[PDB]
Design a protein around this ligand. Structure first.
Ligand SMILES: [Mg+2]
Ligand SMILES: [Mg+2]
Ligand SMILES: [Mg+2]
Ligand SMILES: [Mg+2]
Ligand SMILES: [Mg+2]
Ligand SMILES: [Mg+2]
Ligand SMILES: [Mg+2]
Ligand SMILES: [Mg+2]
Ligand SMILES: [Mg+2]
Ligand SMILES: [Mg+2]
Ligand SMILES: [Mg+2]
Ligand SMILES: [Mg+2]
Ligand SMILES: [Mg+2]
Ligand SMILES: [Mg+2]
Ligand SMILES: [Mg+2]
Ligand SMILES: [Mg+2]
Ligand SMILES: [Mg+2]
Ligand SMILES: [Mg+2]
Ligand SMILES: [Mg+2]
Ligand SMILES: [Mg+2]
Ligand SMILES: [Mg+2]
Ligand SMILES: [Mg+2]
Ligand SMILES: [Mg+2]
Ligand SMILES: [Mg+2]
Ligand SMILES: [Mg+2]
Ligand SMILES: [Mg+2]
Ligand SMILES: [Mg+2]
Ligand SMILES: [Mg+2]
Ligand SMILES: [Mg+2]
Ligand SMILES: [Mg+2]
Ligand SMILES: [Mg+2]
Ligand SMILES: [Mg+2]
Ligand SMILES: [Mg+2]
Ligand SMILES: [Mg+2]
Ligand SMILES: [Mg+2]
Ligand SMILES: [Mg+2]
Ligand SMILES: [Mg+2]
Ligand SMILES: [Mg+2]
Ligand SMILES: [Mg+2]
Ligand SMILES: [Mg+2]
Ligand SMILES: [Mg+2]
Ligand SMILES: [Mg+2]
Ligand SMILES: [Mg+2]
Ligand SMILES: [Mg+2]
Ligand SMILES: [Mg+2]
Ligand SMILES: [Mg+2]
Ligand SMILES: [Mg+2]
Ligand SMILES: [Mg+2]
Ligand SMILES: [Mg+2]
Ligand SMILES: [Mg+2]
Ligand SMILES: [Mg+2]
Ligand SMILES: [Mg+2]
Ligand SMILES: [Mg+2]
Ligand SMILES: [Mg+2]
Ligand SMILES: [Mg+2]
Ligand SMILES: [Mg+2]
Ligand SMILES: [Mg+2]
Ligand SMILES: [Mg+2]
Ligand SMILES: [Mg+2]
Ligand SMILES: [Mg+2]
Ligand SMILES: [Mg+2]
Ligand SMILES: [Mg+2]
Ligand SMILES: [Mg+2]
Ligand SMILES: [Mg+2]
Ligand SMILES: [Mg+2]
Ligand SMILES: [Mg+2]
Ligand SMILES: [Mg+2]
Ligand SMILES: [Mg+2]
Ligand SMILES: [Mg+2]
Ligand SMILES: [Mg+2]
Ligand SMILES: [Mg+2]
Ligand SMILES: [Mg+2]
Ligand SMILES: [Mg+2]
Ligand SMILES: [Mg+2]
Ligand SMILES: [Mg+2]
Ligand SMILES: [Mg+2]
Ligand SMILES: [Mg+2]
Ligand SMILES: [Mg+2]
Ligand SMILES: [Mg+2]
Ligand SMILES: [Mg+2]
Ligand SMILES: [Mg+2]
Ligand SMILES: [Mg+2]
Ligand SMILES: [Mg+2]
Ligand SMILES: [Mg+2]
Ligand SMILES: [Mg+2]
Ligand SMILES: [Mg+2]
Ligand SMILES: [Mg+2]
Ligand SMILES: [Mg+2]
Ligand SMILES: [Mg+2]
Ligand SMILES: [Mg+2]
Ligand SMILES: [Mg+2]
Ligand SMILES: [Mg+2]
Ligand SMILES: [Mg+2]
Ligand SMILES: [Mg+2]
Ligand SMILES: [Mg+2]
Ligand SMILES: [Mg+2]
Ligand SMILES: [Mg+2]
Ligand SMILES: [Mg+2]
Ligand SMILES: [Mg+2]
Ligand SMILES: [Mg+2]
Ligand SMILES: [Mg+2]
Ligand SMILES: [Mg+2]
Ligand SMILES: [Mg+2]
Ligand SMILES: [Mg+2]
Ligand SMILES: [Mg+2]
Ligand SMILES: [Mg+2]
Ligand SMILES: [Mg+2]
Ligand SMILES: [Mg+2]
Ligand SMILES: [Mg+2]
Ligand SMILES: [Mg+2]
Ligand SMILES: [Mg+2]
Ligand SMILES: [Mg+2]
Ligand SMILES: [Mg+2]
Ligand SMILES: [Mg+2]
Ligand SMILES: [Mg+2]
Ligand SMILES: [Mg+2]
Ligand SMILES: [Mg+2]
Ligand SMILES: [Mg+2]
Ligand SMILES: [Mg+2]
Ligand SMILES: [Mg+2]
Ligand SMILES: [Mg+2]
Ligand SMILES: [Mg+2]
Ligand SMILES: [Mg+2]
Ligand SMILES: [Mg+2]
Ligand SMILES: [Mg+2]
Ligand SMILES: [Mg+2]
Ligand SMILES: [Mg+2]
Ligand SMILES: [Mg+2]
Ligand SMILES: [Mg+2]
Ligand SMILES: [Mg+2]
Ligand SMILES: [Mg+2]
Ligand SMILES: [Mg+2]
Ligand SMILES: [Mg+2]
Ligand SMILES: [Mg+2]
Ligand SMILES: [Mg+2]
Ligand SMILES: [Mg+2]
Ligand SMILES: [Mg+2]
Ligand SMILES: [Mg+2]
Ligand SMILES: [Mg+2]
Ligand SMILES: [Mg+2]
Ligand SMILES: [Mg+2]
Ligand SMILES: [Mg+2]
Ligand SMILES: [Mg+2]
Ligand SMILES: [Mg+2]
Ligand SMILES: [Mg+2]
Ligand SMILES: [Mg+2]
Ligand SMILES: [Mg+2]
Ligand SMILES: [Mg+2]
Ligand SMILES: [Mg+2]
Ligand SMILES: [Mg+2]
Ligand SMILES: [Mg+2]
Ligand SMILES: [Mg+2]
Ligand SMILES: [Mg+2]
Ligand SMILES: [Mg+2]
Length: 275
RNA sequence: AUCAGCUUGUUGGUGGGGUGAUGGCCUACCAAGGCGACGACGGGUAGCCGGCCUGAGAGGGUGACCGGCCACACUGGGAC
RNA sequence: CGGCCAACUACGUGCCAGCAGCCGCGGUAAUACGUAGGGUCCGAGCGUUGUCCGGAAUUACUGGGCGUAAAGAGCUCGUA
RNA sequence: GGGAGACUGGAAUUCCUGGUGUAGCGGUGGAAUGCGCAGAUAUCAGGAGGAACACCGGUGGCGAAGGCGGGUCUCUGGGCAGUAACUGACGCUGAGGAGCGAAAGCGUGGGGAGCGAACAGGAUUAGAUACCCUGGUAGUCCACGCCGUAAACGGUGGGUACUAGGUGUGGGUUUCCUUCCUUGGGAUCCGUGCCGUAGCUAACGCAUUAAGUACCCCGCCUGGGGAGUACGGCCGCAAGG
RNA sequence: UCGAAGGUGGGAUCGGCGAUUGGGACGAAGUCGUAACAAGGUAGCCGUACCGGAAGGUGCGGCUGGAUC
RNA sequence: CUGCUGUGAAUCUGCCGGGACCACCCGGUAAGCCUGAAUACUUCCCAGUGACCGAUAGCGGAUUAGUACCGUGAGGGAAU
RNA sequence: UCUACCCAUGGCCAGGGUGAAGCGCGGGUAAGACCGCGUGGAGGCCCGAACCCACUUAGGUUGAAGACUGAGGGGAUGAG
RNA sequence: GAGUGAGAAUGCAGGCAUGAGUAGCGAUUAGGCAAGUGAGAACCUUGCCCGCCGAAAGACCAAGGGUUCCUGGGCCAGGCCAGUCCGCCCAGGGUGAGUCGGGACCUAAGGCGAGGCCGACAGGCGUAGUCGAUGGACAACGGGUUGAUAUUCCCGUACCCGUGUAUGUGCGUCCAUGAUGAAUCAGCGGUACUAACCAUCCAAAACCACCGUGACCGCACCUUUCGGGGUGUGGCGUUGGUGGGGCUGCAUGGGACCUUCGUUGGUAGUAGUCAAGCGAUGGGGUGACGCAGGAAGGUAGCCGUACCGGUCAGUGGUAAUACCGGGGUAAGCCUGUAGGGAGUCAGAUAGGUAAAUCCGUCUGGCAUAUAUCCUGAGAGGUGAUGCAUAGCCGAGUGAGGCGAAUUCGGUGAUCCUAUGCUGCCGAGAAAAGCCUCUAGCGAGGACAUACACGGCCCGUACCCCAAACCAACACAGGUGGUCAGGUAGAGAAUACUAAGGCGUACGAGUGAACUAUGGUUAAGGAACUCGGCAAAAUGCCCCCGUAACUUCGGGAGAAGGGGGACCCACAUGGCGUGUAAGCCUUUACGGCCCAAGCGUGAGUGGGUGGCACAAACCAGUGAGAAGCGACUGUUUACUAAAAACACAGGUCCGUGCGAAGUCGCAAGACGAUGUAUACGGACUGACGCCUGCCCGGUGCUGGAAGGUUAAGAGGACCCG
RNA sequence: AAUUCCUUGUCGGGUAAGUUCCGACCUGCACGAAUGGCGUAACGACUUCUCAACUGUCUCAACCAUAGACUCGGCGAAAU
RNA sequence: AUCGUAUUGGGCCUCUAACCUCGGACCGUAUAUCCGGUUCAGGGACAGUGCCUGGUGGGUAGUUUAACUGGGGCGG
């Protein structure tokens, strides 16, 4: 759950963490690890592509079976629900009957011992990936794909995931966490159940070291920025810039969504906030 | 209790000194407890009693005089 | 010497000067203010003042209540 | 309708989408701020989301008290009648202590249809920082914690034994006119309304579900303000208690 | 060794005073107001939160110590 | 005249040139292709010339010369 | 090749204290919450050298040095 | 005909003056004397004391420089002075590797890049690949040597990489034993194709009865003078078309008739393949990795003891009970302890881009055995009759021969087991090598041993916290890694010392001011000053006791006080370690204790000396208020370190995935190999209370109904 | 007040005196609620004030041993 | 615009054959997430890309911001 840390030092007074009692193994599988490195917020070209992030704690990579489609009709027990920091959620390894173990996203309330099926015959216990032909309308879903068989991309937020609304014709309607409705094929791949670590939103950061570890760099406010560096720069004292806030990269607040996407016709309306 | 914990010779045993007389009265060595919500330790007031006044009684108030003790002798100590 | 409380009339100023333990007494005709008489109480003492009890069953053990005047804690489990 | 979790239903409001359909719709003691001519109101079809369950529904049931009601499942407490098999003084109340607790308020993270403090306008008045109208931010919903106060009222602590009745309701055992249908008649215990004796009370009034007559323990009160306030102590992140 | 007096240093209690401020009661009479007592002209009150010179107003929940029907 | 972008002609009473524009007459035939001679230039070689300098001049360099040296750079850059 | 940032691979931090969760025992409950006792060394924790900084002062300022030296000064298991 | 006339432009280049023989001669260590060479000696050489560093100011490496290394010659030029000396200059000499560092081995960040994509062009990208250590695989010590080089040369003993000899164990292909397995003919899943039977619920072609009455025909009453209309009844009709029976056809379950078996009855274990032994550009394992922390066993190393050799040092006493010096010895080859981990066979399954005896998974059997295997410090033996050493003899720039003892104990690491164990989150590279499996071959390979043989190229001197690198210098600066002795000590601080190297290149004198570095000072203690700036002061360990406030951690080492030296006794005490010996057994590099021996803090008494017993060095000033900033942090290298910045806390907005925003005229890459509890942007800055009013202006988000307007279409009139 | 010109505002505490400081008043030229307001335990080489000790910072300087300054010997600078 | 004859472009709904796909499966390939081709599957006469123009456009660029003045600036 959530465990709050006692104030031993003035720095870690407010630090509270979601204790990971949901851990079973501590040393990740060495076979599936691929060579990875912190890119430092920089491309191969050497320029800093995005500031406020980079540096920190070098970490490893592991392949997740996001698009599980190659093998079907075989069951798998939950091997060990381990901790992968490269995601907000957790990964629970599976012993499939063919002996080919792949990592998958651990759904909410998953504990070691449940049997998971991936295919048409799969039931409604969480972790079962199956096309929309075999799912009731109205069930909460996660790790949702966009086409019948091109790899799953969406619905992997910890705690709130996409909810299926209804099927009409050959197009299916999906409700977004933002409260929006997206039209998607009735043959895409989607799983059942919410994603775990819902209590992760109750994490309290704590200090700056954790944050350089996590990746982000300290944020430099524009009002003290130099005027050449930023439109908010300059001033003798504290000033807001004398104009509406603007990213120093030229454009102010506003529309950024370029229309006319191939899935733009597959969207009914855009998000509305604070209702 | 608009005072909840107090105490370290403090508590208990043994061995010594001590005093007219027993005794942590004093010393050494052993054990950790005794007193505590059937009000401890703290705070304010005040000499106690036979008596006096009041009240049918219960009770309440009080310690004039006398008398039975207690404590003191400008303040604090000590001893022959 | 108004009623509590046995003892009243006249004269002098009228919301002034003043009385007083509770109620309370004077705004031109006071048995309540001041003076006279008159009467009452007490008496070698007479009142005022302060402390204490009684009435005070007004801390109710004898001897109070908790619907509205003051009061049933919000209600249970339950240690001593 | 005792509590908790999950699943599920319909009506209604609002919003969105698409027809039809035209200049008004909403409003009060009267009118104007409000939305329309960019197509409102009305009305049909569909969808979305949130809250709450109209009738049954009552001076009726349960819970110790706050309180509790759309269905369905899951688990569970309390109470009642008969046989009385068994335990054989285990009963009661309970200072300090501990647990539950209306609404509002606070933190974190979500939700948010309607309603609605605060705040804007429009209206009345000499005056409105109100009553009225149009809007609507907390909150009202969910989960975890908190505060622990109400005219928290039956303004009456609990338990036991006794003391005349009449009239309704609910639950269960029996017996008899006996169709053996019948609130038929009778006996019994528990709960809950109303009116009434003796009695009590200053009166209103209570009257077997006592304020009657007693027993056991517990809290509370000693003229009105000051004041349920200052200081001190305890709890709470704070409001505060 | 003990030992009264004296001096070092910080904790409690009783206090006395203290600019100014907060609150209360008594004066009497004046302005601002209509709050409550009759369905007091918005039923009252209680707990609570917000608001306003002021009595008060509103929201939510609770009682009738509320009158008509 | 050429180019980017769209349109788009005739084959000879066809066209475009004749310095916004055309009737009659006047001069040449576009979308295909190339072609020596006069010209510009001199890192190199040869032969000469100079009212050009004679070692702070003349090329930075008559001599260890783009050497020493400075600068990690593109480079700069000596005196003798 | 300094400095700013990042990337990958190595290395560095003498010594001494503070004592979270967790763990077992005895209380507390019906289960808790909680209460003490023994292990724990978690900490951008504490004191303090190597190391990294540069707060004060003096000297120097045609210095030993085109930004230091000497006394003190801060971090010193980490945003190093 | 002029490059034709200088005195200046903080002019240019060269030369030379004064300031002037003035300042300085480069630190917190310091010298003096003797003898020697030399023409000259504080500075060089040799001897004795003194001084300084000694986590360096000693000894090694990397980067860097390149002859500064050694020897011989000389001292006009350089060394801040003379200099016989030098890191000066001239000549000669000096660097020895299968095993130490790189290449023939492989990869990270990143660079190059065939084809290819994009780009007028130049070009930019990146695939297959190839480069790229700061990483990983893979092989040493003691002693000795001359005037300079030593893990390289020699002696002594080994190792592991790679090529060959052939004999000995020994194996099939061309014979054939084994284990099996699999692609062929004949039918069945009371379940239940098709006429029914028993039981149950409902109703299409309205029969009976009642009621309501689209509309029609009307009887009686009311109503306006009669009319519309209203009230009760009758005849239907139903705004609101079944029952009954039969043939026939279809639909639902039964047994059975022809085709679908209980894999063999002959053949064809006759013929065709093959597993040795190498075997992959392929597949799979292994190789393969964090921070922090404690405990245990050991080692380097240190201190004492036995033993071994020597000692008489002009001083009062100690001639051995005392003193000084030794008291060493590797790699490798055996043994496999403490300790860290892990279980064994049979059969089938297709999951690992093809197949698998390999890697996984499921059925079963065997297993809690210190069974079995791997790893693994250390100790013991060999290595070693060897080497070396304290010292004895002749012999001096120096060489040679001989050569004693070589054990116990204790202390003890930051070193080894350890890439381990326990716990935390912030969850900890790649490939080569190695083991093994098959695909594609195949008539000769596999294992040991006597023997002669063959193992590449390059670095190898010297300096390296400095006069040899970077700073223009022989500069008070900077520079990464490895060795870490003794006494006090908590220690790598600090003080003094060993090994070892220096007194670092201007000196000799004179009580001047004055400047700089320090010490002390009557008495007052901030009266100077902007400020207690600077100075001064406390400072260590163990105890006793510590407030206001608070987020219950703190504040707090709060403040303050006491003890601290030496000797003796308690005390042959307690503690650790551990021999002989004892106890025991799966007998071994075994568990228990441990007299003896060694080391050892703590306290209480008694006594003693000084003014002072943490006496040196080293080593917090404390307290009370108020402002800003929550705190640790970072910055104006070289005038300013804060109230600035940043940081965790929150808010708002934009972001639906080849996302937003970027870098890029583009491919492409980051974002992210992440996916609205995630990313970017902006503002504030922990935490408590909160965060009021205002949408005219400017921005942003909605609705474009009206008017204005581009380009392009369109050809009225008019001129010629 | 990090905002206040008059202003050393007025009043109270500290000293002999306090234009600084601390605590209040509001006459806020020209505070103010995310360019955030008010407090806040802890920290700060931050800012300001007071206190005990301490001292040559001072009253008022004196002496002492260093390294220069001085003379001699060797080499030998510059700003202008 | 020349309710039974005419006016050539707008508005929509469709289908695949232009076009798109960072969708799948194969191949070059013995190894290749690049690239190219085929098939299937999704969008589709749209998106995309030019040419012209209208808008927005301190993100970027080149500039300007007088003189007189009893010092300048503010005044005139
Ligand atoms: Mg915090
Ligand atoms: Mg990876
Ligand atoms: Mg950022
Ligand atoms: Mg890094
Ligand atoms: Mg996670
Ligand atoms: Mg910012
Ligand atoms: Mg800035
Ligand atoms: Mg700008
Ligand atoms: Mg600025
Ligand atoms: Mg400003
Ligand atoms: Mg804006
Ligand atoms: Mg949305
Ligand atoms: Mg005694
Ligand atoms: Mg004794
Ligand atoms: Mg009495
Ligand atoms: Mg009495
Ligand atoms: Mg008495
Ligand atoms: Mg007497
Ligand atoms: Mg007596
Ligand atoms: Mg006395
Ligand atoms: Mg006395
Ligand atoms: Mg009378
Ligand atoms: Mg009388
Ligand atoms: Mg009179
Ligand atoms: Mg008389
Ligand atoms: Mg009395
Ligand atoms: Mg009684
Ligand atoms: Mg009473
Ligand atoms: Mg009452
Ligand atoms: Mg009560
Ligand atoms: Mg109460
Ligand atoms: Mg629940
Ligand atoms: Mg509609
Ligand atoms: Mg909603
Ligand atoms: Mg009880
Ligand atoms: Mg009880
Ligand atoms: Mg009690
Ligand atoms: Mg009680
Ligand atoms: Mg509780
Ligand atoms: Mg509510
Ligand atoms: Mg609130
Ligand atoms: Mg909350
Ligand atoms: Mg919330
Ligand atoms: Mg509303
Ligand atoms: Mg508004
Ligand atoms: Mg109630
Ligand atoms: Mg009660
Ligand atoms: Mg009772
Ligand atoms: Mg009666
Ligand atoms: Mg009655
Ligand atoms: Mg009763
Ligand atoms: Mg009573
Ligand atoms: Mg009261
Ligand atoms: Mg208090
Ligand atoms: Mg006072
Ligand atoms: Mg009223
Ligand atoms: Mg009114
Ligand atoms: Mg009212
Ligand atoms: Mg009212
Ligand atoms: Mg209230
Ligand atoms: Mg209100
Ligand atoms: Mg209510
Ligand atoms: Mg009433
Ligand atoms: Mg032609
Ligand atoms: Mg030509
Ligand atoms: Mg160069
Ligand atoms: Mg600890
Ligand atoms: Mg705990
Ligand atoms: Mg400095
Ligand atoms: Mg100076
Ligand atoms: Mg100097
Ligand atoms: Mg320089
Ligand atoms: Mg100093
Ligand atoms: Mg740090
Ligand atoms: Mg000339
Ligand atoms: Mg000149
Ligand atoms: Mg000059
Ligand atoms: Mg001169
Ligand atoms: Mg001089
Ligand atoms: Mg000099
Ligand atoms: Mg020097
Ligand atoms: Mg000499
Ligand atoms: Mg030293
Ligand atoms: Mg050191
Ligand atoms: Mg050392
Ligand atoms: Mg190097
Ligand atoms: Mg020579
Ligand atoms: Mg010479
Ligand atoms: Mg020279
Ligand atoms: Mg030479
Ligand atoms: Mg490339
Ligand atoms: Mg190419
Ligand atoms: Mg490549
Ligand atoms: Mg390479
Ligand atoms: Mg390399
Ligand atoms: Mg060498
Ligand atoms: Mg060597
Ligand atoms: Mg790890
Ligand atoms: Mg020795
Ligand atoms: Mg497998
Ligand atoms: Mg060889
Ligand atoms: Mg070589
Ligand atoms: Mg060298
Ligand atoms: Mg060196
Ligand atoms: Mg140099
Ligand atoms: Mg030097
Ligand atoms: Mg130097
Ligand atoms: Mg260094
Ligand atoms: Mg060390
Ligand atoms: Mg020394
Ligand atoms: Mg030395
Ligand atoms: Mg001087
Ligand atoms: Mg002195
Ligand atoms: Mg003094
Ligand atoms: Mg001053
Ligand atoms: Mg303090
Ligand atoms: Mg403290
Ligand atoms: Mg302290
Ligand atoms: Mg034995
Ligand atoms: Mg045994
Ligand atoms: Mg002494
Ligand atoms: Mg800091
Ligand atoms: Mg900082
Ligand atoms: Mg900087
Ligand atoms: Mg600076
Ligand atoms: Mg600097
Ligand atoms: Mg500075
Ligand atoms: Mg700074
Ligand atoms: Mg700061
Ligand atoms: Mg910050
Ligand atoms: Mg905030
Ligand atoms: Mg923000
Ligand atoms: Mg925001
Ligand atoms: Mg507007
Ligand atoms: Mg505006
Ligand atoms: Mg036209
Ligand atoms: Mg102020
Ligand atoms: Mg100020
Ligand atoms: Mg302030
Ligand atoms: Mg001052
Ligand atoms: Mg002001
Ligand atoms: Mg202002
Ligand atoms: Mg703001
Ligand atoms: Mg602002
Ligand atoms: Mg504060
Ligand atoms: Mg002095
Ligand atoms: Mg003087
Ligand atoms: Mg002297
Ligand atoms: Mg000097
Ligand atoms: Mg001198
Ligand atoms: Mg000189
Ligand atoms: Mg001008
Ligand atoms: Mg002027
Ligand atoms: Mg002038």
């Amino acid at each position: 759950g959530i465990r709050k840390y006692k104030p031993t030092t003035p720095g870690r007074r407010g630090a509270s963490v979601s204790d990971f009692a949901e851990i079973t193994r501590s040393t990740p599988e060495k076979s599936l690890v691929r060579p990875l490195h912190g890119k430092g917020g920089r491309n191969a070209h050497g320029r800093i592509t995005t500031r406020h992030k980079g540096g920190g704690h070098k970490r490893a990579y592991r392949v997740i079976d996001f698009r599980r489609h190659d093998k079907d009709g075989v069951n798998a027990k939950v091997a060990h629900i381990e901790y992968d920091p490269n995601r907000t959620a957790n990964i629970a390894l599976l012993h499939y009957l063919d002996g080919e173990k792949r990592y998958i996203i651990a759904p909410q309330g998953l504990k070691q011992g449940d049997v998971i099926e991936s295919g048409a015959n799969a039931d409604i216990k969480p972790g079962n990936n199956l096309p929309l032909r075999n799912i009731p309308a109205g069930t909460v879903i996660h790790a949702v794909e966009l086409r019948p068989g091109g790899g799953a991309k969406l619905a992997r937020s910890a705690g709130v995931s996409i909810q299926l609304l209804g099927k009409e014709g050959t197009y299916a309607a999906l409700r977004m966490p933002s409260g929006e409705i997206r039209r998607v094929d009735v043959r895409c791949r989607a799983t059942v159940g919410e994603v775990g670590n819902a209590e992760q939103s109750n994490i309290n950061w704590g200090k700056a070291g954790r944050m350089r570890w996590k990746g982000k760099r300290p944020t430099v406010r524009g009002v003290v920025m130099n005027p050449v560096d930023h439109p908010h720069g300059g001033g003798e004292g504290k000033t807001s810039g004398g104009r509406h806030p603007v990213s120093p990269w030229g454009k102010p607040e506003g529309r950024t969504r370029k229309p006319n996407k191939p899935s733009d016709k597959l969207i009914v309306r855009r998000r509305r906030t604070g209702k």
